[PDB]
Amino acid sequence: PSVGQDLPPVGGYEPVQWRRNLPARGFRPLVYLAALCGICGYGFYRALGGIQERRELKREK
Amino acid sequence: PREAAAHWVPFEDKANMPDNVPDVVEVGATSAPLLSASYFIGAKCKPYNDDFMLCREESQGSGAIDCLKEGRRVTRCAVSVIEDINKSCLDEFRLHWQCLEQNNHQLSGCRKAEALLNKCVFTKLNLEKKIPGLRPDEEPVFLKKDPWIKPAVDDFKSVRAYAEAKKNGTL
Numbered sequence A: 001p002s003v004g005q006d007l008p009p010v011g012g013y014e015p016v017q018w019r020r021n022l023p024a025r026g027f028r029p030l031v032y033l034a035a036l037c038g039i040c041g042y043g044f045y046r047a048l049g050g051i052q053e054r055r056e057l058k059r060e061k
Numbered sequence B: 001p002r003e004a005a006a007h008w009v010p011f012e013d014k015a016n017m018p019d020n021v022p023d024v025v026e027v028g029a030t031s032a033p034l035l036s037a038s039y040f041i042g043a044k045c046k047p048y049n050d051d052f053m054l055c056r057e058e059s060q061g062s063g064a065i066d067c068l069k070e071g072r073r074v075t076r077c078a079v080s081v082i083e084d085i086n087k088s089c090l091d092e093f094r095l096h097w098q099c100l101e102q103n104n105h106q107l108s109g110c111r112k113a114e115a116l117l118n119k120c121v122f123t124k125l126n127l128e129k130k131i132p133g134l135r136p137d138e139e140p141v142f143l144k145k146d147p148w149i150k151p152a153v154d155d156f157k158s159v160r161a162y163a164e165a166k167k168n169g170t171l
């Protein structure tokens, strides 16, 4: 006979996940390129404005 | 002229000026008050400064000893303007040069004190601050509102005095 043996459940276990699960995340690459362009352009706007004002301060001094 | 190199000692000369040379007062302001007053000195003493420099050029090598009387005029005019500032606008002038002493002598760090100083000097001395060489399109930076470059800490006494002047209506 068989009494007290480790055995599986009558209905079985729920299925486990074994297939590859690496979902794609993130905006499309051109969105990141556009954001980089916008950040750099705004930074250049600020930096060149600062350089020009610094030159006028140099004139005053 | 180059700065001194490896080993040097400073030495003072104890002689007096030759008695033929007429004596003159010397400017007693230090670097910060002088920088604060520089534009007013320029405005008032331009003809004498120009004459002194022209004399020096025309002397063609003997300028120190040939322009002493022109230099005497230059120094007297500078002393006169600083005396006038000390008589009519001392509080604001002191605000401005103490601010400069806190801000590495950068005029951009002291615009609030400078506004009061300029208004005082214009109303009681009829001197105007002006930057030479700009076109009418170009805006002088000291008149600019909302500048890119601002001081790290707006000067305390200057902020208070500026707000008070805005209440009073002087500025």
Ligand SMILES: CCCCCCCCCCCC(=O)OC[C@H](COP(=O)(O)OCC[N+](C)(C)C)OC(=O)CCCCCCCCCCC
Binding pocket: A040, A041, A042, A044, A045, A046, A048, A049, A052
């Ligand atoms: C190859 C580069 C081509 C880029 C063309 C972009 C022109 C867009 C028009 C906006 C300019 C503007 O209108 O802003 C003017 C600004 C700031 O000057 P301001 O003080 O505000 O103007 C007042 C003029 N004053 C001072 C005489 C009174 O000037 C700039 O420098 C900012 C230009 C934007 C940054 C572009 C850099 C591009 C990235 C370079 C990476 C190698």
